[PDB]
Amino acid sequence: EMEKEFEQIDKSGSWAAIYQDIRHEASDFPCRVAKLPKNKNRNRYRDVSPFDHSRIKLHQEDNDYINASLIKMEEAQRSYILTQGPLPNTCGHFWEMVWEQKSRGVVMLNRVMEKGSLKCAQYWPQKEEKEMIFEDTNLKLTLISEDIKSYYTVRQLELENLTTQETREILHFHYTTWPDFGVPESPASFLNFLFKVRESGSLSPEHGPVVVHSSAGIGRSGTFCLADTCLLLMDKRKDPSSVDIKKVLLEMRKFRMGLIQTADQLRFSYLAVIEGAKFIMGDSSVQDQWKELSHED
Amino acid sequence: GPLYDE
Ligand SMILES: [Cl-]
Ligand SMILES: [Cl-]
Ligand SMILES: [Mg+2]
């Protein structure tokens, strides 16, 4: 089914039509808290807000608002937190969320500067000896080490809660070559990165939900989570071919608006899942073939 | 404000 559908849609040049139908059929729920006048400076884009029903709340009497949503894929048995790229005044709120939700990993799919414009604050330290202290939420964040590859970087960060005196290791999975409104260089380089996240244990149910972000926390981020989710379903279902990508994406859109921003991201998502299915079907060797193909040197 | 889609 899935692979035949990709064919017919490509044959038809109907990607745009298919993607527009998704847009038209997506959920609409209220975002009243996001829209409160006091939260204007907590929102990067006017047109990207969390639904009230799925918003992550900060453990704060002051103002519990962050632009972040919990995507809870019931059949897949995986949750993700999708958030915007934090603003200069929200970096503290970001790491407070990571802390309160017990996340292990943060997946960043954007750069801080894209096409000449600041898309995301510099929310993590670039140098070991220049740790960050978030005064408002009483957190400290230290770069321990990093592993730079050709198209992504993995960082080991230590997050300390200054109130409770506890520390946690956070893994930062940063895809540094995925353009805004664009797609990865290939399914293999995408999968190699996704499988690296998976193998780190950051997506395990013993931790809180991964935080996945881009600039808005919907386009690239949507692409990443939809692939992962579909590949999970492929592995759980009696029939691996029953996975309907369009349905899985409308399901995710119940939780955060606007996931997958272009038709070509939608198409890439299908490519990824189709290729990724070789692993799921049992051929655990193809991981090594993605690694080599991705040119991570 | 800025708009992500556009
Ligand atoms: Cl208000
Ligand atoms: Cl960057
Ligand atoms: Mg140095």
Residue among A276, A261, A258 nearest A71 (CA): A258
> Mutation test of the interface with chain B: which of A41, A45, A218, A260, choosing the one with the most B Cβ atoms within 10 A?
A45
Q: What type of residue sits at position A100?
A: E
Q: Which of A46, A219, A258 sits opposite B1 (nearest CB)?
A: A46
Give me the sign of the Cα torsion angle A269, A271, A273, A276: negative
CATH number, residue A246: 3.90.190.10
Q: How far is CA A33 from CA A110, A215, A275, in A?
A: 26, 20, 40
Q: Are strands A105-108 and A166-175 parallel, antiparallel or unpaired?
A: parallel
Per the structure, how many domains does chain A have?
1
- Write the DSSP string, A87-110: PTTTHHHHHHHHHHHT--EEEE-S
Read off the tokens for A84.
């915007």
Give me the residues of B, 1-6, that contact A with CB < 8 A.
1-5
- Alpha carbon of A117 to ligand 1 centroid (Å): 28
Q: Are strands A117-118 and A113-114 parallel, antiparallel or unpaired?
A: antiparallel
How many CB atoms sit inside 10 A of residue A162's CB?
13
The ligand that comes nearest to the alpha carbon of residue A145 is: 3
Residue among A273, A274, A275 nearest A290 (CA): A275
Residues near ion ligand 2 (Cβ under 5 Å): A 111-112
Range of the domain at A192: 1-297
Assess contact for A15 and A263: CB atoms under 8 A. Answer: yes
Q: Do B4 and A45 touch (CB under 8 A)?
A: yes
CA angle (A288 as vertex; A297, A148 as ends), nearest 5: 25
Beta strands in A84-231 (DSSP E): 105-108, 113-114, 117-118, 132-134, 139-148, 152-161, 166-175, 210-213
Q: Do A44 and B5 touch (CB under 8 A)?
A: no
Chain B residue with minimal CA distance to A259?
A: B5
| Chain A closest-CA separation from residue B6 CA (Å) | 10
Helices A245-252 and A15-25 pack at an angle, to 10 degrees, of: 40
The ligand that comes nearest to the alpha carbon of residue A40 is: 1
How many CB atoms sit inside 10 A of residue A208's CB?
18
Asked how this structure was determined, the answer is X-ray
Q: Do A43 and B5 touch (CB under 8 A)?
A: no
